[PDB]
Ligand SMILES: CC(C)Oc1ccc(-c2ccnc(NC(P(=O)(O)O)P(=O)(O)O)c2)cc1
Ligand SMILES: CC(C)Oc1ccc(-c2ccnc(NC(P(=O)(O)O)P(=O)(O)O)c2)cc1
Ligand SMILES: CC(C)CCOP(=O)(O)OP(=O)(O)O
Ligand SMILES: CC(C)CCOP(=O)(O)OP(=O)(O)O
Ligand SMILES: [Mg+2]
């Protein structure tokens with residue numbers, strides 16, 4: 001409801017974001033070609049997802065700040081900081097699709113697979129990261145929460161890269177790694193690689209912007225939001241294999257990439273010795289026939305039905321956490337996000 | 347002299363840098379494997395260069411702060427911030443060697459060419475970047491210049507990526523780009539990709555740490571240091587082709603990578619029509635025989651002798667700039683750096 005409402009306004013602000021980041025060409029014509037590249041990078045990689053994180057900043061901001069304090073400039077800062085989390089996301093996906101050997105993203109060919117781009121996308125991605133701090137300087141430099149936002153974006157990146165490092169270590173190319181695919185390890189990976197930047201970061205940004213800076217308040221929000229993030233990544237794993245890619249906008253690679261997916265961890269908890277063998281001989285390889293063998297094994301094990309049960313039990317648990325930890329923040333802040341992702345198909 | 351002095355002390359501090367960045371494992375065992383990866387990334391990619399930038403921070407700090415204010419903690423902050431510029435460097439080289447298809451760096455195989463690393467080095471590189479801000483928080487958070495250092499590292503990265511973007515745009519694989527190899531373009535590329543982070547950043551960091559924060563003072567230092575940086579990159583271009591790679595620690599790729607090198611720009615200013623053709627048919631291609639053809643052309647044009655003349659005229663000009671703009675800073679701050687790089691062979 002409230003996200004659907006805000007979507008079109010959020011997305012409409014993207015022009016200004018592009019215009020402000022491309023305006024520092026005025027005084028330095030010599031960087032013109034780079035700034036034109038930057039604009040193409042922004043248009044290609046910052047558009048076409050759900051904008052759940054940027055919108056969470058805006059929705060939460062509106063719900064946490066007294067409407068009488070939501071003047072024209074305040075609101076612009078809020079959808080600029082929302083856009084900052086979108087740019088963080090864009091940076092991460094561009095680099096991640098290279099590392100995962102992905103083909104499509106958000107319904108088009110991954111940036112690095114475009115003829116003429118290739119591994120230059122590595123620089124493109126980092127530029128997107130640099131844009132976050134340019135926007136924070138340009139719009140929030142005078143605000144009491146400026147340092148807070150800077151340290152929060154920098155810390156969230158570090159935590160996410162640490163998680164990406166656990167993701168890549170647990171998934172070596174060319175090697176079996178079945179022994180490492182545990183529930184415990186899974187939880188640690190998704191906590192760091194997904195939950196901090198995709199759930200905590202946007203709500204925490206809006207908190208700091210509303211002057212809510214206490215450690216206890218931030219730790220409470222984190223208890224809900226890290227659990228929401230773990231759940232969200234489990235849905236992403238489920239969708240990598242069982243989603244419709246004209247809906248999800250992306251082709252899956254977890255089985256080929258030898259990834260510690262929620263699906264493989266479940267598969268393992270339930271496999272007989274002979275099925276364990278099927279998994280061992282077929283998992284983490286590029287052969288289409290071997291990926292199909294693994295899928296058939298998952299479906300044999302009713303894994304889609306096991307995912308639907310986990311999703312219900314988990315949502316219930318997240319709602320309990322909301323009842324426990326939302327105060328003094330409005331529960332709507334957390335529920336609006338839960339309902340945006342509960343039972344999602346993309 | 348003064349750099350040679352400080353080298354061994356600087357390098358000895360690397361253990362502590364590793365220890366502090368790997369100490370946040372204590373409380374979170376679950377990230378243990380990632381932190382062990384981080385340590386391997388640090389040891390492989392942060393060690394073995396000249397440490398000119400980290401050392402410039404330390405030397406300049408010692409020369410700008412009254413010795414009576416150089417207590418144990420102050421000095422540690424200074425060689426930590428020196429190490430931050432070294433980590434920035436490490437991040438950049440790891441990513442750059444992937445983009446340039448390089449083979450060796452600092453006398454060993456590039457990180458991404460190690461079996462088992464490959465494009466995972468993209469995440470490794472960004473982790474190195476994240477380490478800078480962790481160290482600034484851990485050591486300088488209480489200092490009046492903390493925000494100043496954060497914005498200075500973030501701005502320097504942005505400017506360097508903009509330069510890297512001009513470097514990659516001017517050097518398309520598969521395409522002739524002779525028309526773009528101008529003196530003007532060359533100057534713009536190296537100003538952004540090299541001069542800001544390699545010259546301005548370390549001296550400016552030491553300035554801010556000495557409480558020297560005025561815009562006029564920073565603009566004066568910048569006039570010297572951007573010129574020093576352009577000169578330094580011209581030497582790097584010269585070394586890509588004419589250096590001994592057991593001395594430089596790296597194999598060159600500029601001609602194969604179609605790069606707007608100082609050498610190609612000079613070549614072009616002096617080529618006859620027929621030599622222009624030789625360049626056109628041979629430049630920017632992987633064929634060993636075609637790279638050799640270009641080299642023979644450079645040597646035919648006395649380009650090594652032209653480089654030696656430019657180096658002298660330029661050093662003289664940089665020394666004039668020092669006479670103009672060093673005040674009120676001690677000229678030794680700038681000269682120590684000039685003499686460390688004038689006539690360098692690595
Ligand atoms: C510096 C850069 C390499 O760091 C990161 C880049 C991307 C990510 C990240 C985190 C969480 N999810 C993704 N992408 C998903 P996705 O490709 O959209 O299914 P995953 O590959 O984990 O399934 C990427 C994390 C860190
Ligand atoms: C995010 C990352 C891709 O950004 C950068 C990474 C590296 C660099 C950079 C800047 C200046 N020099 C280098 N390396 C040199 P080098 O390889 O050591 O000769 P260049 O390839 O320019 O000749 C790299 C600049 C930006
Ligand atoms: C963490 C992760 C699944 C990366 C993809 O996130 P998303 O599914 O939120 O992607 P969009 O930004 O495309 O909506
Ligand atoms: C800017 C550039 C030439 C990158 C290499 O710099 P360097 O030559 O300063 O490298 P070390 O850090 O290896 O000394
Ligand atoms: Mg992926």
Ligand SMILES: [Mg+2]
Nearest residue numbers: 096099100167
């Ligand atoms: Mg991934």
Ligand SMILES: [Mg+2]
Nearest residue numbers: 236237240254
């Ligand atoms: Mg996925």
Ligand SMILES: [Mg+2]
Nearest residue numbers: 442443446448
């Ligand atoms: Mg290079």
Ligand SMILES: [Mg+2]
Nearest residue numbers: 442445446513
């Ligand atoms: Mg390069």
Ligand SMILES: [Mg+2]
Nearest residue numbers: 582583586600
């Ligand atoms: Mg070079």
